[PDB]
Structure formats: structure tokens, C-alpha cells
Amino acid sequence: TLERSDWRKFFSEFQAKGTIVVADERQADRAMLVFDPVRSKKRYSPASTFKIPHTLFALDAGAVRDEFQIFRWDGVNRGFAGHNQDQDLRSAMRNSTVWVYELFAKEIGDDKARRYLKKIDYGNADPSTGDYWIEGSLAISAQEQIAFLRKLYRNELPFRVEHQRLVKDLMIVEAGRNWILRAKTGWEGRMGWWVGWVEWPTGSVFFALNIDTPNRMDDLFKREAIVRAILRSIEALPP
């Protein structure tokens, strides 16, 4: 691996404190790039980035059939336009609609959740807590997120390939003729994430960033701002 201490300029540009791991697979046998190596190995609640493996759990357990199933909103104003309405998997993913996944968690159960977490060796694989991925015991590091994402990319997770493909499709955030950005944000109040990858004809560039959010909601834009600036600097995103 290679430390990129010079990347501090990107974090300072947005007055943020955090870490980022970038694994560029476009060429062969390349070192992972990391800013703040120690923090990159520190485990934190995955927050909504957990929707990536959780969707696999839900599809595997039959808690959700496919991308067309609709889950009905209870009418409760949770203070999120994206949340205050019926949802399908894509809207739930795109808007981090936690209540939908709370439904899945209830149907899956704690015992099965533990088995699923163990089979994918996800962080501390501890679902002790309803939303164990937000306020529960579950925690994972930026480096561990990269390892997990690479397995999903390669269809190497112990789930139906159809489910792995559906989740990768749900993760689409942006795309051009020769590139596709797949990612997921996360925020649990004081910690924010943005993990995913951008695929190019010669290979994919994985990333996992987390930052503290002392300004709460006002710091959320920094997640994508920092990652995009870094990705652009290594030509992993169009200029």
C-alpha cells in the first residue's frame, strides 16, 4: 500500500477530518492508496452503507422479491421527502430509507442476521442492538469496506449472482458512455461515509471514505466532494 499524505489538501479544502482508501484495479499489482492509514483500519458503524449487504440478506431471505415490490409508507412524517412515500428497493437505496430495511431486519431476525454477517465476514459481524447497523454493535473499517466491495464486484459473495447483480444495479449513481459510478452514502449523526467504485474499460477504482461530521447535516456534501476531487486527480472520473 502507499500513503498519500498529500491528499490532506483535499480534506483541508473542505475543512474535514477523515480517511479514504482507494484501490485502483485498472492496471495489475498496484498498491492501495490511503490517506490516514491508521483511521482507515478503525471500525465505525456502517450506517446506511450497510444497505449494500443488507439488501443481499433481504433478497436471500425472501424479505423482498425483486426491484418491483412496493413497501407502503405509514404516513409518518420522518422529515425526509425521499422517505415520506411508498418505496421500492431503488428508492430505498437512493434515499437511505431506513424504515424499509427495518422491515427486512424484523423478518430476517437476529439469529439469521448473525449467520449472514458471519458468512461474509463483515466487520465485527455483530448485529447486537432494531437498526443494529446504525445504533447497534455492528462496525467496519474503510479497508474492510473495500475488501467487501471487491467481492461484490467479482460476484464472489455467498449469495445468488442475480442478487449480487441487482444490488450493484441499485448502487448506480452516475454513468457515462464508458464509465459507471456505483456507490452508497451513510450517516449516523457524527460519522459520514461514501463507499463504492467507478468502473472503466480497463478496470474498476474502489473507494471508501469516512469523515467526522461536527456540523451534522451541513457536512454531508463533503463526502462526495472529497472523493470526487480525489478520483478526478487520478483520472478515475471525468474532468
Q: Which of residues 116-175 bind its own copies (CB under 8 A)?
A: 154-155, 160-162, 165-166, 168-169, 172-175
Annotated binding-site residue? 82:
no
State the CB neighbour count (10 A cutoff) for residue 185. 19
Annotated binding-site residue? 185:
yes
Q: Which of residues 187-226 bind its own copies (CB under 8 A)?
A: 201
125: left (phi over 0), alpha (psi -120 to 50) or beta: left
Alpha helices by DSSP H, listed for 77-203, are: 89-94, 98-108, 110-119, 142-153, 161-170
Which of 45, 48, 96, 204 does the annotation list as catalytic? 48
**Shortest Cβ 199–its own copies spacing (Å):** 8
CA proximity to 140, closest of 152, 126, 153, 160: 126
CA proximity to 11, closest of 47, 40, 43: 40
Annotated binding-site residue? 186:
yes
Q: Is 233 in the site for its own copies (CB under 8 A)?
A: no
Nearer of residues 29 and 111 to its own copies, judged by Cβ: 29
Point out which residues pair with 34 in neighbouring strands.
3, 21
Selected from 39, 94, 184, 222, the binder of its own copies by CB under 8 A is 94
Size of the site for its own copies (CB under 8 A): 23
Nearer of residues 2 and 70 to its own copies, judged by Cβ: 70
Q: What's the Cα-to-Cα distance from 8 to each of 3, 4, 126, 227, 230, rounded to whole Å?
A: 11, 8, 32, 12, 10
48 as an active site residue: the answer is yes
Task: Report the 3 state secondary structure along 115-135.
Answer: HHHHHCCCCCCCCCCCCCCCC
Nearer of residues 98 and 166 to its own copies, judged by Cβ: 166
**Binding site membership: which residues?**
184-186
**Binding site membership for substrate: which residues?**
184-186
Q: Any idea which residues carry the catalytic annotation?
A: 48
Where do contacts with its own copies occur on this chain (CB under 8 A)? 66, 68, 90-91, 94, 154-155, 160-162, 165-166, 168-169, 172-178, 180, 201
